[PDB]
Symmetry: C2
Subunit: 370 residues, 2 copies
């Protein structure tokens, strides 16, 4: 009878997957600090951790790396669809549609985690074919001898990347794998709660993640940096924005009351990129914007979010800005699917109510009297 619009501070599940410490700027996956996983872990090891609940042994990780690598190919129907639509379609619409097709095409029963592994393996293949097609370049098929992040860069560039580029992509993807209960994870859980299949869940996740208010899954901050153009123009550009009551993009969180830990980590790993003159300039710009933003907005609890740096990092590695939401999905599908698996251990239908405003029992007025 009290409205809880937006479900602010309403707990919909218990979890052991991800803990966010909003106050102190900390984030844990299955009890491990995101700082330590970024320092020492890798895409496949964290995907193992999130899905199976423990760090893998050497043998377990070797088997699991093989399993992912051998599930990367996409169907002819899907690849043809991507080629047809890459240049005209919204990339999140393309990804929504191709994961829907993937689900339609998979007639096997059960095996949530096996289907999660398929989606996680194949999404980069789809994203890469979008990017290659837009540039009038040929599809680069996945190379199952390569690890996840190395292969992802190989499929964009058509040649094997540097180990430093690979490492930066690997960390940037680990940083996006889960964030507890956001709108997209909630969409996945509403669908799963009906005992619909895991592809249907993920399709709803993608559908939610497209929306600009989701948070995190946009390149708005990168666009800002590009519009600033030169480091010497930062103070003036920011002045034009703040004076007119516009936000600095990449700042603010509903959750962290300090620097987002994912932003801190990306800023550090960005140093390890080799940068052409454009990227170096864009990082100088971003750093200056960050400095001014923190002086002005810091006291109001407004700090850089993960998407202050994420779009610039993905751009630096050769992705078009408007693919960035797809890349987010490529990592977050692991969290989505882990959350669904956890919930379904003790499922409950999600079925809220509304508060009704209006008269009841109106007389049906026949059409000739209206």
């Amino acid at each position: 009878m009290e409205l809880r619009k937006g479900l602010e501070d309403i707990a919909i599940k218990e979890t052991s997957i991800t803990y966010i410490d909003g106050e102190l700027g900390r984030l844990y996956y299955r009890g491990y600090s995101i700082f330590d996983l970024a320092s020492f872990s890798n895409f496949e090891e964290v995907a193992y951790l999130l899905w199976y609940g423990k760090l893998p042994t050497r043998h377990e990780l070797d088997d699991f790396k093989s399993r992912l690598a051998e599930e990367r190919s996409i169907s002819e129907d899907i690849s043809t669809f991507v080629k047809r639509t890459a240049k005209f379609g919204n990339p999140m619409d393309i990804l929504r549609t191709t994961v829907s097709m993937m689900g339609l095409e998979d007639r096997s029963e059960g095996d949530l985690i096996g289907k999660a592994i398929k989606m996680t393996a194949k999404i980069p293949t789809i994203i890469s074919l979008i990017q290659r097609t837009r540039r009038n370049q040929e599809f680069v098929e996945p190379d199952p001898s390569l690890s996840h992040s190395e292969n992802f860069l190989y499929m964009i560039r058509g040649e094997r990347p540097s180990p430093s580029d690979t490492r930066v992509l690997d960390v940037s993807l680990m940083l996006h794998m889960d964030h507890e209960m956001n709108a997209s994870t909630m969409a996945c859980l509403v669908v799963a709660s009906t005992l619909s299949d895991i592809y249907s869940s993920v399709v709803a996740g993608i559908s939610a993640l497209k929306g600009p208010l989701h948070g995190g899954a946009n390149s708005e901050a990168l666009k800002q940096f590009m519009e600033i153009e030169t480091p010497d123009n930062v103070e003036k550009y920011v002045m034009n924005k703040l004076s007119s009551g516009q936000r600095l993009m990449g700042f603010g969180h509903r959750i962290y009351k300090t620097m987002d830990p994912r932003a801190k980590i990306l800023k550090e790993y960005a140093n390890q990129l080799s940068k052409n003159e454009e990227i170096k300039r864009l990082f100088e710009i971003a750093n200056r914007v960050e400095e001014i933003g923190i002086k002005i907005l810091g006291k109001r609890g407004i700090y850089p979010n993960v998407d202050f740096y994420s779009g610039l990092v993905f751009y630096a590695m050769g992705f078009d800005p408007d693919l960035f939401p797809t890349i987010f999905a490529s990592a977050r599908v692991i969290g989505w699917t882990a959350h669904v698996d956890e919930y379904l251990k003790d499922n409950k239908l999600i079925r809220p109510k509304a508060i009704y405003v209006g008269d009841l029992g109106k007389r049906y007025v026949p059409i000739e009297e209206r």
Copy 2:
């Protein structure tokens, strides 16, 4: 903090669309009783009411009927996809994918209700192409001179239906158009709340409605009556089901604690259907299941819901059983889109939380030490 798992009795929005009286078994659309609308309205008039918030004039309804009729065709790319997938694919996955394709191709801005009208006009064409393809029958194109429900039966059967058959389908569809904040409507709203597009919302609605604890139940209720096989076996089958703690399909509701008004109306209208020996038998079985279920489960507020008779009604009208959730969606899309339009007048991101019950501060052990 309290776990509100399932969101039982949490209100997520203010609404003027649908009021459910769970204790007395009453249902209103914009304050008009479902019984009066079944008696005297029609698919197009109720759609108008739900989208535009008032009963149409004669002129307004005539224009709106034409507008729907003119938008029933589907693009060749979509029909090709349906024909290619219909024999082996799950119908709700086909429908999920086609709506996803429609959205991808419509990058036009705003016009939520215009897009809703398009989806509502085209979904029956898609469903009909699935059924015709599966039966190795030639596609029957929509006839713009026919109204919504007459046209739907014409496309399925390849023959113009009786006025009585038309009325039974038309009523059956009206009964499914909206039901306040059920799980599929909640999926649509979570997605809309991010400012994702209306097709993304509807794709998430389809994804949820598929599940057998939601719209998928209608197929499961008919499957239950077929499994019972003979009226004589009803008592034995039902008692074993209840002894073993298995659910009677098409019984119970999160809101109704009495007979669902939609079930009452379906049962009444089902009387006008001509029934061969198979259909007569299944109705006898259903009626007996209803009686024993009400006797035993009605004592604790568990009664037939809309899914109890809907599948049998659709089956009796010549639809394949696998299609019943798609037919649900063909009507519910109006309510989904109306709910989204209402919500977006004052949007708020839907972002709940989790309660963390795992470990924290675990030391990362490098792989060689595991």
